[PDB]
Amino acid sequence: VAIWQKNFKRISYAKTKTRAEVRGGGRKPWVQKGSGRARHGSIRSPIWRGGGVAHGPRGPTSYYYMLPMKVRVQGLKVALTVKLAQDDLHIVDSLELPTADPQYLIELARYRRWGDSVLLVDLEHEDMPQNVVAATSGLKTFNLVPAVGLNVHSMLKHQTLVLTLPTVAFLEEKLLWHNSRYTPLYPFRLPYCDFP
Amino acid sequence: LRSRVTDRYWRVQEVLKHARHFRGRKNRCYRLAVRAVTRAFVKCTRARRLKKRSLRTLWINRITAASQEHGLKYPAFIINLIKCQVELNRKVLADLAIYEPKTFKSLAALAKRRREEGFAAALGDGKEPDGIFSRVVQHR
Amino acid sequence: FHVRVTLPPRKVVDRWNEKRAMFGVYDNIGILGNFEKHPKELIKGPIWLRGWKGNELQRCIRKKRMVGNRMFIDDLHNLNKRISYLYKHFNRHGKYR
Amino acid sequence: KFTRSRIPDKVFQPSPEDHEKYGGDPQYPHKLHIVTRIKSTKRRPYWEKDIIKMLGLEKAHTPQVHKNIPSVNAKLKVVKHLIRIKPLKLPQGLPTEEDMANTCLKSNGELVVRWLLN
Amino acid sequence: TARGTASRFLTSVLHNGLGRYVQQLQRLSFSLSRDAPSSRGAREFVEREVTDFARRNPGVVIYVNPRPCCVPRVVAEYLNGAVREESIHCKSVEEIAALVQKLAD
Amino acid sequence: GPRALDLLRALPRVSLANLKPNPGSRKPERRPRGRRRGRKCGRGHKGERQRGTRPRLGFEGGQTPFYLRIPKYGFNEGHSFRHQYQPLSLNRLQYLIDLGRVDPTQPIDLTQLVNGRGVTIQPSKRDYGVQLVEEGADTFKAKVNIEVQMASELAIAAIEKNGGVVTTAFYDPRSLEILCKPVPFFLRGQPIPKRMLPPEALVPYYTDAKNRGYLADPARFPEARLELARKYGYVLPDITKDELFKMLSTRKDPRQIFFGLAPGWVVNMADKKILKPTDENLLKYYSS
Amino acid sequence: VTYFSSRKGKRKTVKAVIYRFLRLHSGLWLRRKAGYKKKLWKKTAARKRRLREFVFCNKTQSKLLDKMTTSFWKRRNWYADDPYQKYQDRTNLKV
RNA sequence: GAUAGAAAUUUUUAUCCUGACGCUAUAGAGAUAGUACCGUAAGGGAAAGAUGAAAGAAUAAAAUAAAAGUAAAAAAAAGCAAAGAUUACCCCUUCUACCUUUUGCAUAAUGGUUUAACCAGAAAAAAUCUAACAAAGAGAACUUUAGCUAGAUACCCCGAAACCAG
RNA sequence: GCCUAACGAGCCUGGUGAUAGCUGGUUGUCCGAGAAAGAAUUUUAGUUCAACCUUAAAAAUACCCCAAAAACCCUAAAUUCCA
RNA sequence: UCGGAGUACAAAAAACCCUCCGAGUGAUUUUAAUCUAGACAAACCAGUCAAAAUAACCAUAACAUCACUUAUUGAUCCAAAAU
Ligand SMILES: [Mg+2]
Numbered sequence A: 001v002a003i004w005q006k007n008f009k010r011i012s013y014a015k016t017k018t019r020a021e022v023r024g025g026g027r028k029p030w031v032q033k034g035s036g037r038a039r040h041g042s043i044r045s046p047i048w049r050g051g052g053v054a055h056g057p058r059g060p061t062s063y064y065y066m067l068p069m070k071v072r073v074q075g076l077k078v079a080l081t082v083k084l085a086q087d088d089l090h091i092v093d094s095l096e097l098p099t100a101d102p103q104y105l106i107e108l109a110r111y112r113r114w115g116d117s118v119l120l121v122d123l124e125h126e127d128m129p130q131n132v133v134a135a136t137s138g139l140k141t142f143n144l145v146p147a148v149g150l151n152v153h154s155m156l157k158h159q160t161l162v163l164t165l166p167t168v169a170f171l172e173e174k175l176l177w178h179n180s181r182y183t184p185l186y187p188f189r190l191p192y193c194d195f196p
Numbered sequence B: 001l002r003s004r005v006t007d008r009y010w011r012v013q014e015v016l017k018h019a020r021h022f023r024g025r026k027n028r029c030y031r032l033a034v035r036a037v038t039r040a041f042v043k044c045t046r047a048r049r050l051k052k053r054s055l056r057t058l059w060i061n062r063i064t065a066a067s068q069e070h071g072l073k074y075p076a077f078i079i080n081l082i083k084c085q086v087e088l089n090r091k092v093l094a095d096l097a098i099y100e101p102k103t104f105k106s107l108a109a110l111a112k113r114r115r116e117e118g119f120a121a122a123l124g125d126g127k128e129p130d131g132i133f134s135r136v137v138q139h140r
Numbered sequence C: 001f002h003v004r005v006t007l008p009p010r011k012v013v014d015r016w017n018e019k020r021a022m023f024g025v026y027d028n029i030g031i032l033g034n035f036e037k038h039p040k041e042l043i044k045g046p047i048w049l050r051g052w053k054g055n056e057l058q059r060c061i062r063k064k065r066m067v068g069n070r071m072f073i074d075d076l077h078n079l080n081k082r083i084s085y086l087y088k089h090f091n092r093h094g095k096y097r
Numbered sequence D: 001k002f003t004r005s006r007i008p009d010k011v012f013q014p015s016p017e018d019h020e021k022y023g024g025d026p027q028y029p030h031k032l033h034i035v036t037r038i039k040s041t042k043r044r045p046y047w048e049k050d051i052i053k054m055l056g057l058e059k060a061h062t063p064q065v066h067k068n069i070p071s072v073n074a075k076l077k078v079v080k081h082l083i084r085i086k087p088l089k090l091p092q093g094l095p096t097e098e099d100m101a102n103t104c105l106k107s108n109g110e111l112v113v114r115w116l117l118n
Numbered sequence E: 001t002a003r004g005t006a007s008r009f010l011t012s013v014l015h016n017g018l019g020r021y022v023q024q025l026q027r028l029s030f031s032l033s034r035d036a037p038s039s040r041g042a043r044e045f046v047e048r049e050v051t052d053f054a055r056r057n058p059g060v061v062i063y064v065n066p067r068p069c070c071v072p073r074v075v076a077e078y079l080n081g082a083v084r085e086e087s088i089h090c091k092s093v094e095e096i097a098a099l100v101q102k103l104a105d
Numbered sequence F: 001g002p003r004a005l006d007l008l009r010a011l012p013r014v015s016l017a018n019l020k021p022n023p024g025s026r027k028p029e030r031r032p033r034g035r036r037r038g039r040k041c042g043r044g045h046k047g048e049r050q051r052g053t054r055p056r057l058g059f060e061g062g063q064t065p066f067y068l069r070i071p072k073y074g075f076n077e078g079h080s081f082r083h084q085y086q087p088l089s090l091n092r093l094q095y096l097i098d099l100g101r102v103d104p105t106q107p108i109d110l111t112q113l114v115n116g117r118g119v120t121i122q123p124s125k126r127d128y129g130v131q132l133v134e135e136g137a138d139t140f141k142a143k144v145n146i147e148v149q150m151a152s153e154l155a156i157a158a159i160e161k162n163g164g165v166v167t168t169a170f171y172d173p174r175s176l177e178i179l180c181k182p183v184p185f186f187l188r189g190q191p192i193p194k195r196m197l198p199p200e201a202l203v204p205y206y207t208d209a210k211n212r213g214y215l216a217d218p219a220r221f222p223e224a225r226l227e228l229a230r231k232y233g234y235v236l237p238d239i240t241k242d243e244l245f246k247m248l249s250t251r252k253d254p255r256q257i258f259f260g261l262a263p264g265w266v267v268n269m270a271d272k273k274i275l276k277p278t279d280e281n282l283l284k285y286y287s288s
Numbered sequence G: 001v002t003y004f005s006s007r008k009g010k011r012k013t014v015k016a017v018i019y020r021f022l023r024l025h026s027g028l029w030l031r032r033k034a035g036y037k038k039k040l041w042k043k044t045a046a047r048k049r050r051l052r053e054f055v056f057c058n059k060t061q062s063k064l065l066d067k068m069t070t071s072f073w074k075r076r077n078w079y080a081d082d083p084y085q086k087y088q089d090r091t092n093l094k095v
Numbered sequence H: 001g002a003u004a005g006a007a008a009u010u011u012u013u014a015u016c017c018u019g020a021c022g023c024u025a026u027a028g029a030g031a032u033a034g035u036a037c038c039g040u041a042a043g044g045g046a047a048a049g050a051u052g053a054a055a056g057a058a059u060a061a062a063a064u065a066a067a068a069g070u071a072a073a074a075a076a077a078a079g080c081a082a083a084g085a086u087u088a089c090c091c092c093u094u095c096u097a098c099c100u101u102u103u104g105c106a107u108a109a110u111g112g113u114u115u116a117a118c119c120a121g122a123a124a125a126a127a128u129c130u131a132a133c134a135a136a137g138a139g140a141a142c143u144u145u146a147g148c149u150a151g152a153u154a155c156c157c158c159g160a161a162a163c164c165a166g
Numbered sequence I: 001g002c003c004u005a006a007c008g009a010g011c012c013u014g015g016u017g018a019u020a021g022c023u024g025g026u027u028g029u030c031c032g033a034g035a036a037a038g039a040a041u042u043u044u045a046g047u048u049c050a051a052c053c054u055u056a057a058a059a060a061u062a063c064c065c066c067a068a069a070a071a072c073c074c075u076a077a078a079u080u081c082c083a
Numbered sequence J: 001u002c003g004g005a006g007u008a009c010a011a012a013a014a015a016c017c018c019u020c021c022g023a024g025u026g027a028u029u030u031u032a033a034u035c036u037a038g039a040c041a042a043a044c045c046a047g048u049c050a051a052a053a054u055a056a057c058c059a060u061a062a063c064a065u066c067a068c069u070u071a072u073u074g075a076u077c078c079a080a081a082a083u
């Protein structure tokens, strides 16, 4: 999952010009025989100095692949499990903050020995407390993300995870549904019997 | 992603450091040095193999010299030294010849005496008459 | 092989900037969001590569099919030549056949 | 065409003088063969190579013990020009389980059971 | 290559081993890091066997220096005045112990 | 249980610095560099192979190819116009019923089977529905009203011994895809079309009573039921006296697709509404 | 064989193989004997029977036909009253 | 035959979140420039820059003195120029330069004066490995009598006389 | 013959990265095993199979092979099959 | 292109612009079927045999026969046939 999150978003904008795309090189520079030098065709051959590249990178390359659903969900479960097991996962309630001081959070983390980086996870985006928003808008190692923004790469990048209790319930109900679900006859976006 | 080689200096130097004592352009030009270094290493291996043979021949020549200096031929000296259960290799025999003239003369006298003992035994063709130095001792 | 004689300035790059902190944050948007949007919509780039992958010939064909009518003259000609060359090399050339 | 060679039975009919020439017992045959490979299987036919391989004689100048049965005697006759064969001699009898680690094979063709006593 | 490199005769310093044996290794200075993943072998050797080696050989002065370094090194300085610097970069504890014993010997 | 979790406590932090894939999951790629993989780079010596100009697959060097010397014969002749029927075993039907994927209390249709994931139908592959086979007719003990497109006498007898109802109907590909995927059709935004009649090749199959044709004469049905009962030696149950007789007798109109719906209705799922035509011409067309 | 098409970029198939061959789902291929309709008056009854009889293809020709045909022809097929439905599968293959 | 190849019928949700696991002066546009120059013309078409805060600090200051080519410092019997060595540079002994093509090359068969920078393996149908789920698999369309999905394993460069159109 | 220093048919641009069974080249280390040709082919300057061989996986028999056995006017070295 | 003899002496195979015979069909009636084990040969395509069981004649054979009997023959596609 960590490799997939890094790779599937990649589109390499590396395009070099082959011998057919270089400007000139439309005629033979010299006749085949009698000159005494090596035989050549277009002066834009890859052997020549100003010639094109033999293979090189060709056009925008889209590195895109989709891992299966039960592999991505399992990776999320394993990330949560290892974070809990290594004493790096902390459950906080309601994510309330007494003051908008960004330095207060740093002192709280240092006193609780959370580490260098902390990822706070909230349930919703518009329901975030403005105190926490203002506190984490100026901090680098402390990152505030909503419940739909949880990912293995960020969970491994940040040393400590902090989850709100409704977020814990939300993640629980999201991850436990794939254990006993059908294969999608049509995409789960469209209305189902029990699924929204 | 254009990838170029930056340690080409060290790659060339790792080969050129073994060719600095060569003569001509082989000690400077890299194209001429790789072939010279490879042949140098091949010759080094071949000569390491031949060094044992060359030194053995040198030791044999020295043992001869010191043997006909005592009026004894090398094959007779060697066979009669073996017959006396004296298992000294050619290197040690040459060392004794160069640095221990008296010990080498004693060895030559013993080998000769064994030679006349064998000759007398062959002439006599008798089971009972046996020489003093011709007796064979078993392992203990 | 002449290497530079001076040390280059050390590139002081921070691993905790905005992009390196927010990278891949919404990759599980579908999984954790009552499926409404695939991770396809999060792919930013050319129109013909938003959630697609293929070899050079397939990429060229797809590019010509979608944006081929809006191309420039010289790039369209180069694309046609490249398509022809890739077709010929892929179908008539090779070892395993 | 070069093929395998049939050896007539008259070759293996020992003469009365052969026994005292080669130190063999004319009336009890010996029990075991000590077989050593002298020459190489290079420039030799593939069937001879296979016989040498199946006789366990890959490494030259290394003795191997075999039975005195006609089944192995046939192959020994096939490759008899590449090997030296001696009769195994047991002056002190078969080695028991207590003398397995103190045995030796002297070059004269005998197996000593008590070797290097202290 | 003999003709390419230098050569010397079989010699011993101070006619060592004649009157008494003196360990020719004088000091061993390890330079490592506490945060570099490459210095894992050096760190674990320091935790485990540096004390046992020091007790076994009291005639060698052992220095250990943690510092922000990427290539863990060991500098052995002998009674001859000779300084041999070896790299212990990404080697297991068994290999480090073998190298230290070789340097001492 | 999972002692790896306990072992993880002593181990350091799991981060992006220390991540290793499965040993053997990724076979390393080999490039034509070096003494071994260089020197013609695995392409061999001169010829067409090294220069990459060897002929196509079936070509044999001017000789008449094997795939061109064998005479043509009809094997796939009209393969894209032959009707296909996915088989459903009575053992699998029993498995579905007893695991609860499908319920015998309600009428079971191809829609219900698809919803319960018992069968998969691909209309674009010329599939014409689900047929019934008798792989597990020995241990079939469920009383279920089955509607399929093709049925065998043994399967029909096995169902009737328990006391179910078997009926075979026809579906042209459009009505078939609508029935397999009603939800994608309901968000399509079109009224439900009529069910087309079977072609002349299938009219006799659905007009007879022995195969339980949906267009057959219902008064001939008890005769054929009694024939099968006397042939297979099982007592024919009095189905009219069962509590689920209405469910067992629930049918579909030959022009109707679903259960209880009518052709021409628009199912607005957003407002949970049904829009029905009122025009005389529209009603005549939809009921013709 | 077109490994990469020009329009869709997919892998095409040769129509001769599908016209004069039949693939069973077990991996075997079915074909007719060559010359079963030519000069029947000149041939013996046993030879005519051999010509009329169906035959199989070995591993090399089977692999060639698999390479030359797309995976669409390798699907599982349930035809109505299919004569080869009984031959689609393999039984008692101790390998 | 090589090959070509639809359609009926389906899916596609508004805006920002846009920059770069693209190059750094033999690379990246040919470009400092379609300019010099070569051509009657159509046309072809380059190489060239490096101190510093200040050169209104040129009795001007600091880092390499590292490629090939020379000087410091021409050479002393004998030999693919090297190795074994040796107190000692040679002198002694031993090895028929390297790739390519060939049954076979020191061959007097081909290629290269030297240095620097560029210059040549690319595709996932069937299969192996790994992993998820498994009579089911896949984030929509298909495949399924242990199978479906995902990932990793694969297939070069230069060279004609020629043909057509303007 | 000449048609701007090469005319059995000019030069430039484009098709064009024309095509070559033909020649040349194909760039790091080490380790394991390792092949000289039967049949087709406008084919013998090449391809496609078979026999060999390489990496994996299932099994159980595999080479040497005594008798006995393999044609009829004469026929050697010796072959095939098996304990 | 196909067959026979020697080369190729005794299971099989084995080449030359090696030495010789031939074949690209005739005559007659016993007008010589269907289906299927198991085998020969063979790169493939092709060529060969064939036990049991069925239809019609003795109620006991049917391999069509002879000419050195071995060769007397041609693949797809396509055209004409009309089952
Ligand atoms: Mg061009």
Ligand SMILES: [Mg+2]
Pocket: A026, A027
């Ligand atoms: Mg041109």
Ligand SMILES: [Mg+2]
Pocket: A036
């Ligand atoms: Mg020249």
Ligand SMILES: [Mg+2]
Pocket: A041, A042
């Ligand atoms: Mg050209």
Ligand SMILES: [Mg+2]
Pocket: A050, H030
């Ligand atoms: Mg340029």
Ligand SMILES: [Mg+2]
Pocket: A017, A050, A051, A052
């Ligand atoms: Mg360029």
Ligand SMILES: [Mg+2]
Pocket: none
């Ligand atoms: Mg040795």
Ligand SMILES: [Mg+2]
Pocket: F029, F030
């Ligand atoms: Mg590759």
Ligand SMILES: [Mg+2]
Pocket: F030
């Ligand atoms: Mg490879």
Ligand SMILES: [Mg+2]
Pocket: F035, F036, F037, F038, F039, F040, F041, F042
């Ligand atoms: Mg190679």
Ligand SMILES: [Mg+2]
Pocket: F039
């Ligand atoms: Mg090379």
Ligand SMILES: [Mg+2]
Pocket: F045, F046, F047
């Ligand atoms: Mg060739």
Ligand SMILES: [Mg+2]
Pocket: F062
């Ligand atoms: Mg032909």
Ligand SMILES: [Mg+2]
Pocket: F086, F120, F121, F122, F127
């Ligand atoms: Mg299906």
Ligand SMILES: [Mg+2]
Pocket: H001
């Ligand atoms: Mg043709």
Ligand SMILES: [Mg+2]
Pocket: H025
């Ligand atoms: Mg430039």
Ligand SMILES: [Mg+2]
Pocket: none
């Ligand atoms: Mg210089």
